């Protein structure tokens, strides 16, 4: 038992759970909220905008799965759905950067609007508060300064890089004194959108509403939502001689060190072990070391593709799997 | 059994292509040059305007929906644009004087 | 009239310098040794015999 | 065959039927055909429906059986050393079907230190889920590789790999599921013999209750093949470049 | 093409990094390894998006019709 | 069982005669119209 | 209130409620999953998993099968509503360590 | 030209499920079916 | 060489043979009402059974 | 019993176009050949 | 013009000759991920290695993985090009495992997998024959001028050919009633008035 | 209206019908017609 899953060259073991009663005589370990109460435990490491990583202590496999899970599945976000194109004589034909639009992030969070209702036909489907609007007209044209030829394409043609920052946002009635105090931008203003050549211009304007993750991929609000498992180092017999220094460089730099008193390698800070597993070719560190990794140790790492804090889509996350849970309490169960 | 499919690859034409106007013409959307390269493929410049991409492959039994050599991808990643492919077809007509 | 081979030298894409064949529109990476009868480009193969 | 609609846009049909077809799913197209009748369309099912020919004409023999993963899936389960919880014997017996087949558990195989099910209850529990199911089978056969034993003292139960399997009242004894077992080519299979004593009917509803299980099961188990475990050990070096 | 806006994989964006990589190169002469992961690409799922990324829209724009 | 698409099942058809043991069905069926699945395309009345 | 959800099937259900077989629309694995795990530390139930039919279409079927002792239905009632708690003292210990920082 | 039951003098043909019958607008009986074409 | 001619190998003998049908009699015998053989092999039973 | 109920239910039932079945089973894919 | 997406039935490539088609199409909370959370793109199974006996695959994924991290193109030529042991010491040095075989967490269930993974980018490029132009059904439709048979060919309305291969194959059922109903009443029926006396 | 437009002379002209097939200000004979005013709709996945 003891939690830890025990790798090896060719195998892991007990990955399951075995933390039920009815597993042995003794039925110890029962469901008890107070007795998990004092067990649990958060840890938060390094947080900053943009990006999270805190710790999660003593959960089984399960309820910590669907939490990843429902980080890039369910809590919504917005981007674009309807591109109504104009005058458009580039040379990145209509549905390929229609496409790229879909795929920018927005700054503005969800809970601001509402859900659009797709029974309603298309002439009030897109209310007031449900849809907001945004925009960009742009025409290359020649610069006329004095450079010499072939050189930088961004002084013989202005505006002929177009990028995320050109998308003007165009406010609709009854909201501009809602959004007066945050104007909406791209998270990142500054990708390439498209290039054109003078005598070449698009206009359009696009429909960004209020979309699920679980049905597009452009609404998704994290980039990627992972976790890991505390890796875990025991050691036999002390390590002495030559050895210590063979020991040490089949590890990345910082996560053992040589004990400076006497000849023995120690395990330095750690969590910045990843598995090479390169001690088991050695056949020499065979007995020395049974290495593991703990089965209730979850390095949470997060971060957002810029559409609102790490912190709070995690918060979102666990508050609507209750509301996804206590829904179906209240429905009755028919034959 | 590659040497009579990789006439069938699909990618780039030439830099021409958005001018030319042939019968039956497909596309792909984003190419990429591949990973491991060879002698051969630099001295035709090949890599200069390549035909398919180099995704992420895990090797594996899943689902069952994979038992001789079938294909399992995910729906995000077609979503973020894996290889829209892009028809592109001619049509003809003559304008034609009678005797009268 | 002598229908002829692309990249030949009777030929304008002849040593190009791809801006003779920037105004031509013609791809740099183009081989040549066909022939454009009337539409539809065509290639002879190479036959052999005993 | 019967018919089911399906929002997408290609044929789809159940894998192991593959093995008549012998196709290869690399762009080969089938056509299908229906009958125009009201007689001709109870013609097609009494004769040509795939419950009557489970066997080929050609021996006698079963045709459609396990194709070249389904062995593997079944063989990691039934491994002398695959041990269960209770938790995830229910997670495995709750596979094979979709929730509606009852089911009753028979007592773990080690019984002390913890209860421990073993990988070949599971499998006795997709021939006969419960006692109102009436399959009940006998039956002796070797594997495909059978390393024989003392041979003049043990019998062939007793070799040193699993070996000879041995099924006594619908449990697994001894044995694993190696394509001799339950695959195609040998007349002495599991499949043959619910057919031989339990009709069409139950020998159908019997291995499709496997290949639910071993799609859903053993990419949650994982399975993969690399440099290490096709690459030459340095003892096979040295010995290569003598002999 | 023009670089994809996102990765093909996990997803986050690199739009704004095509540009960097070639400044990246013209000025302080590099190795285009340590080039980019100082640009903050640790995954390579997302390196592989802009190595293999051959740009022809600047092949296709000298084709333009209006001179 | 195989499965099949439903843009070839709304295009091969069968024909079925109308009884008094399915006419409640085919009701239900035909005001379907040839546009989603459930329904018909042609229709042959004894006197037609 | 609705009843497109949670719907006992009565072809594989015994005479009392001591095994049923419930059908969940519009739930995947994220919900199945963690559902699985509450239910298995109940010290009743002998039996209790799911299974998706087929992708394509959007349904789950959840297994409870127990002793005699309680009917399977309170079970998964008391189960469903244990989560609920479960969800609470994670968000609980959670916030006041942002707060605090 | 003319429908046998209403009399129709327009005739519509089909190309959605390439049946290629041919239905007077007004009642929807069709005029004719399996078409002979010239190959 | 073998795919071309086994289709047409087994086409062939097809049409010699194609029409031998047991009667209720137990007795094969062909569409002209002949005999060929009186039981199928030595006693008559189903080959594939 | 079931030893002459596999036997009985083994003989050949009249009807079977055994002429068809058998040419199709036969078709399938110093020194002489 | 139009373009379309990979969805299922798509014949794809794999440059060392491997004709595959697409059999579903998963989101991204079923498919598995590494301890940094990459998600793999195309799923193969194991099973065609030992067969097919290609080598090269299992060593040009090593090839590229190393030379993404290292951040260099790497050559793959005949007779030649970059070995194996140069390229072991090169990811080793990343921190992953020294011949790719890496170990990744299930998505479905949350815990590891009890085998190891074999993971790295390969190149997978796309073939021709999309299936959206070759789905064809015929119901009912267009007859030749001199047979009053279906035509052939799919765009001439198609309607296919039942050969004489399977005539041979449905009396060996001994089916004998859609034998009719398949060669004249869905195909060919047509009703002719004989005299009986000099008959003809 | 924008109506014909030259291939590399690239000069907008509206041709009067069934008087010319050749362009202005260039004997070049091949002219593209131009991409409408008309708005279109698309979606964004
Ligand atoms: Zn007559
Ligand atoms: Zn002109």
Redesign the interface.
């Known amino acids: 038992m003891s939690n830890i899953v025990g790798i090896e060259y060719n195998r892991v073991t007990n990955t399951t759970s075995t933390d039920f009663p009815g597993f042995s005589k003794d039925a110890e370990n029962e469901w008890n909220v107070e007795k998990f109460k004092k067990d649990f435990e958060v840890n938060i490491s390094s947080l900053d905008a943009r990006e999270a990583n805190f710790d999660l202590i003593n959960i089984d496999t399960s309820i910590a799965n669907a939490f990843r899970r429902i980080m890039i599945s369910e809590v919504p976000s917005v981007a674009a759905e309807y591109v109504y194109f104009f005058n458009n004589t580039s040379v990145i034909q209509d549905e390929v950067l229609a496409h790229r639009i879909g795929l920018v992030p927005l700054k503005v969070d969800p809970d601001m609007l509402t859900w659009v209702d797709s029974n309603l036909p298309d002439d009030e489907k897109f209310t007031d508060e449900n849809t907001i609007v945004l925009s960009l007209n742009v025409k290359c044209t020649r610069n006329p300064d004095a450079p010499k030829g072939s050189t930088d394409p961004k002084e013989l043609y202005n505006n002929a890089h177009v990028y995320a920052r050109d998308l003007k946002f165009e406010p609709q009635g009854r909201q501009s004194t809602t959004f007066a105090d945050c104007p909406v931008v791209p998270a990142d203003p500054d990708i390439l959108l498209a290039k054109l050549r003078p005598g070449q211009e698009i206009s359009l304007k696009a429909h960004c509403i209020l979309g699920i993750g679980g049905d597009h991929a452009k609404f998704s609000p994290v980039s990627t939502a992972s976790y890991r498992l505390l890796p875990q180092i025991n050691i036999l017999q002390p390590i002495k001689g030559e050895s210590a220094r063979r020991f040490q460089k089949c590890f990345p730099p910082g996560v053992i060190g040589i004990d400076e008193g006497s000849d023995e390698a120690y395990v330095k800070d750690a969590r910045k072990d990843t598995v090479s597993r390169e001690v088991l070719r050695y056949e020499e560190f065979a007995d020395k070391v049974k290495l593991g990794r703990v089965r209730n140790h979850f390095i949470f790492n997060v971060e957002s593709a810029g559409a609102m804090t790490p912190e709070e889509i995690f918060f979102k996350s666990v508050r609507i799997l209750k509301n996804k849970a206590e829904y179906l309490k209240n429905c009755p169960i028919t034959q | 059994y590659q040497c009579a499919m990789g006439k069938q690859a699909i990618g780039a034409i030439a830099y021409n292509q958005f001018k030319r106007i042939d019968t039956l013409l497909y596309l792909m959307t984003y190419p990429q040059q591949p990973m491991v390269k060879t002698k051969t493929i630099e001295l035709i410049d090949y890599d200069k305007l390549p035909a398919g991409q180099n995704a992420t492959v895990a090797v594996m039994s899943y689902s069952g929906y994979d038992i001789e050599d079938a294909l399992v991808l995910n729906k995000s990643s077609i979503d973020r644009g894996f290889g829209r492919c892009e028809t592109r077809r001619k049509t003809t007509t003559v304008l034609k004087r009678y005797a009268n | 009239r002598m229908p002829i081979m692309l990249r030949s030298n009777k030929c304008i894409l002849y040593d190009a310098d791809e801006s003779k064949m920037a105004k031509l529109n013609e791809c740099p990476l183009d081989p040549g040794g066909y022939f454009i009868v009337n539409g539809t480009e065509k290639v002879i193969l190479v036959q052999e015999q005993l | 065959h019967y018919a089911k609609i399906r929002p997408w846009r290609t044929f789809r049909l159940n894998e192991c039927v593959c093995t008549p077809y012998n196709a290869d799913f690399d762009g080969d197209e089938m056509n299908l055909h229906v009958p125009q009748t009201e007689e001709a369309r109870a013609e097609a099912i009494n004769l040509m429906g795939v419950k009557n020919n489970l066997l080929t004409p050609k021996s006698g023999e079963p045709i459609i059986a396990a194709t070249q993963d389904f062995i593997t899936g079944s063989y990691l389960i039934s491994h002398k050393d695959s041990f269960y919880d209770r938790a995830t014997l229910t997670q495995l017996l709750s596979m094979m079907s979709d929730g509606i087949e009852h089911f009753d558990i028979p007592p773990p195989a080690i019984m002390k230190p913890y209860y421990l099910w073993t990988g070949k209850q599971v499998f006795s529990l997709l021939i006969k889920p419960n006692h109102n199911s009436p399959v009940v089978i006998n039956l002796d056969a070797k594997n495909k590789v059978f390393v024989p034993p003392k041979s003049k003292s043990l019998p062939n139960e007793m070799s040193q790999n699993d070996g000879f399997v041995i099924i006594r009242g619908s449990q697994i004894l001894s044995g694993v599921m190696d394509k001799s077992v339950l695959g195609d080519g040998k007349k002495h299979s599991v499949f043959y013999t619910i057919l031989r004593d339990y009709g069409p009917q139950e020998a159908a509803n019997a291995m499709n209750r496997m290949a639910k299980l071993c799609a859903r099961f053993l990419g949650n188990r994982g399975f993969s093949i690399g440099i290490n475990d096709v690459t030459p050990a340095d003892d096979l070096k040295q010995k290569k470049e003598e002999l | 093409?023009?670089?994809?806006?996102?990765?093909?994989?996990?997803?986050?964006?690199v739009?704004?990094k095509?540009?960097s990589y070639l400044n990246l190169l013209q000025e302080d002469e590099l190795?285009?390894?340590?080039?980019?992961?100082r640009l903050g690409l640790?995954?390579?799922?997302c390196?592989?998006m802009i190595?293999?990324?051959?740009d022809?829209?600047?092949?296709?724009?000298?084709?333009?019709?209006?001179? | 069982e195989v499965a099949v698409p439903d843009r070839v099942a709304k295009v091969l058809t069968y024909p079925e005669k109308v009884t008094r043991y399915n006419r409640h069905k085919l009701q239900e069926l035909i005001v379907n119209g040839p546009n989603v699945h459930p329904g018909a395309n042609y229709l042959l009345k004894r006197n037609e | 209130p609705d009843r497109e959800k949670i719907k006992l099937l009565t072809q594989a259900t015994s005479e009392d409620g001591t095994s049923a077989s419930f059908q969940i629309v519009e739930e995947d694995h994220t919900l199945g999953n963690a559902l699985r795990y509450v239910i298995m530390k109940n010290p009743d139930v002998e039996f209790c998993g799911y299974s998706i039919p087929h992708p394509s279409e959007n349904l789950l079927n959840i297994r409870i099968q127990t002793y005699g002792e309680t009917t399977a239905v309170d079970a998964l009632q008391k189960g469903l509503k244990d989560l609920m708690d479960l969800c609470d003292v994670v968000e609980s210990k959670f916030t006041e360590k942002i707060k605090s920082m | 030209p003319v429908c046998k039951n209403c009399h129709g003098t327009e005739f519509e043909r089909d190309l959605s499920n390439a049946n290629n019958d041919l239905v007077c607008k007004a009642c929807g009986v069709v005029s004719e079916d399996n078409p002979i074409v010239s190959e | 060489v073998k795919t071309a001619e086994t289709g047409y190998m087994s086409r062939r003998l097809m049409k010699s043979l194609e029409d031998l049908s047991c009667q209720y009699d137990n007795t094969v015998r062909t569409s002209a009402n002949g005999i060929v053989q009186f039981t199928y092999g030595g006693d008559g039973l189903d080959p594939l059974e | 019993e079931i030893a002459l109920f596999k036997y009985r239910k083994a003989r050949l039932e009249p009807g079977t176009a055994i002429g068809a079945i058998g040419a199709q089973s036969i078709g399938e894919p110093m020194n002489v050949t | 013009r139009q373009n379309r997406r990979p969805e299922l039935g798509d014949k794809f490539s794999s440059r060392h000759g491997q004709k595959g088609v697409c059999g579903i199409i998963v989101k991204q909370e079923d498919m598995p991920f590494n301890d940094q959370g990459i998600v793999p793109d195309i799923i193969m199974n194991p099973h065609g290695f030992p067969s097919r006996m290609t080598v090269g695959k299992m060593i040009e994924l090593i090839s590229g993985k190393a030379g993404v991290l290292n951040g260099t193109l790497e050559y793959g030529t005949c007779f030649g090009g970059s070995k194996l042991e140069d390229m072991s010491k090169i990811l080793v040095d990343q921190g992953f495992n020294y011949s790719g075989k890496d170990m990744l967490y299930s998505g479905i269930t949350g815990e590891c997998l009890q085998a190891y993974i074999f993971f790295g980018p390969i190149y997978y490029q796309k073939l021709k024959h999309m299936v959206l132009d070759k789905m064809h059904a015929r119901a009912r439709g267009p007859r030749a001028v001199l047979t009053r048979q279906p035509t052939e060919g799919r765009s001439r309305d198609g309607g296919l050919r039942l050969g004489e291969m399977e005539r041979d194959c449905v009396i060996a059922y001994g089916a004998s009633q859609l034998l009719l109903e398949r060669l004249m009443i869905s195909s060919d029926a047509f009703e002719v008035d004989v005299c009986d006396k000099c008959g003809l | 209206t924008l109506k014909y437009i030259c291939a590399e002379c690239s000069s907008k002209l509206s041709l009067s019908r069934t008087d010319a097939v050749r362009c202005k200000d260039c004997g070049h004979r091949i002219l593209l017609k131009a991409r409408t005013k008309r708005l279109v709709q698309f979606e964004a996945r």
């Not at chain 5, 093409?1 to 964006?13: L, Y």
């Not at chain 5, 190795?31 to 992961?37: K, V, Y």
């Not at chain 5, 022809?56 to 001179?67: A, D, Q, S, V, W």
């Open positions: 093409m023009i670089v994809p806006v996102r990765c093909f994989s996990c997803g986050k964006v739009g704004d095509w540009e190795d285009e390894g340590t080039a980019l992961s640790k995954r390579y799922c390196r592989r190595l293999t990324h051959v022809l829209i600047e092949k296709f724009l000298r084709y333009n019709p209006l001179e």
